[PDB]
Amino acid sequence: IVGGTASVRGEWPWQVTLHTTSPTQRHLCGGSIIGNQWILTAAHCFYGVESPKILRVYSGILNQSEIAEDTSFFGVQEIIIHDQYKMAESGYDIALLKLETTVNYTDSQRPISLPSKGDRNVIYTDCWVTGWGYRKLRDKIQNTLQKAKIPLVTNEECQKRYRGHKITHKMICAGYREGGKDACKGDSGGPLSCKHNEVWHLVGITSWGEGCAQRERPGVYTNVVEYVDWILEKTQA
Ligand SMILES: *[C@](=O)([C]([C][C][C][N]C([N])=[N])[N]C(=O)[C]N1C(=O)C([N][C]([C])[C])=[C]N=C1C1=[C][C]=C(Cl)C(Cl)=[C]1)C1=N[C]=[C]S1
Numbered sequence: 001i002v003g004g005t006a007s008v009r010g011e012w013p014w015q016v017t018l019h020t021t022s023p024t025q026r027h028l029c030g031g032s033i034i035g036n037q038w039i040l041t042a043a044h045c046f047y048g049v050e051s052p053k054i055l056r057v058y059s060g061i062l063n064q065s066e067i068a069e070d071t072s073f074f075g076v077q078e079i080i081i082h083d084q085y086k087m088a089e090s091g092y093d094i095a096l097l098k099l100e101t102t103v104n105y106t107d108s109q110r111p112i113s114l115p116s117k118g119d120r121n122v123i124y125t126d127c128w129v130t131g132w133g134y135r136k137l138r139d140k141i142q143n144t145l146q147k148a149k150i151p152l153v154t155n156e157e158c159q160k161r162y163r164g165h166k167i168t169h170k171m172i173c174a175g176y177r178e179g180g181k182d183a184c185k186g187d188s189g190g191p192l193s194c195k196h197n198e199v200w201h202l203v204g205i206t207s208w209g210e211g212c213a214q215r216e217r218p219g220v221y222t223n224v225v226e227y228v229d230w231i232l233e234k235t236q237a
Pocket of ligand 1: 028044045046047087088089133182183184185186187188189206207208209210211212213218219220
């Protein structure tokens with residue numbers, strides 16, 4: 001996260017850090033608890049990933065340093081990538097992680113509510129992007145979970161900032177005209193959480209963008225509300 005600040009422990013209880021154990025363990029992407037055994041994240045996070053066996057999901061984390069060899073984690077039983085996904089910039093950058101065990105909800109770990117189709121006309125004015133991602137284009141994973149408030153921008157506007165791409169209705173953008181605050185490398189798969197009516201809603205999934213926090217270059221996120229039926233379909237046993 002660029003231009004953000006340290007989060008308060010348990011402030012974003014649905015936020016998980018997805019680690020890979022290959023070649024040595026390291027943070028790979030962000031993700032969001034949406035079910036007792038379901039993590040919603042970004043499909044592009046799995047480039048090269050051949051098996052769920054090398055994945056480890058850690059919940060209730062604030063600092064990466066909390067994560068050691070003796071720290072409990074959730075194994076991944078299945079990786080479900082949208083069959084229409086090809087690359088981040090094209091869309092359908094969404095994926096589900098079916099955990100090998102169920103998450104016991106608590107103040108440090110609980111699920112975030114999915115947006116409702118009737119919530120497509122709502123104007124979210126209190127959105128935040130979070131992650132252990134880069135603070136600078138060429139930096140490294142951050143120890144403490146960062147947060148940044150970022151206003152949403154209409155797709156028409158986003159399109160103007162990305163004339164080389166096609167911004168579809170299954171995408172949603174957020175950023176400041178002058179940049180300064182944005183998601184960056186390592187925040188991918190993480191949530192774009194918007195508080196509406198005293199309830200936090202998973203509005204988007206950190207997907208892509210040109211550089212980080214650049215002026216006139218909003219971050220592009222997967223528009224979650226467009227995938228509620230897909231999510232129901234893939235999670236319904
Ligand atoms: C994600 O942490 C980052 C988040 C960056 C979002 N940036 C922003 N709001 N300014 N994701 C990517 O870098 C995704 N991605 C891209 O955004 C582009 N953008 C073009 C316009 C330059 C290109 N390629 C990717 C991409 C990166 C990595 C993989 Cl493995 C794949 Cl398949 C695509 C992370 N995503 C992966 C690791 S960190």
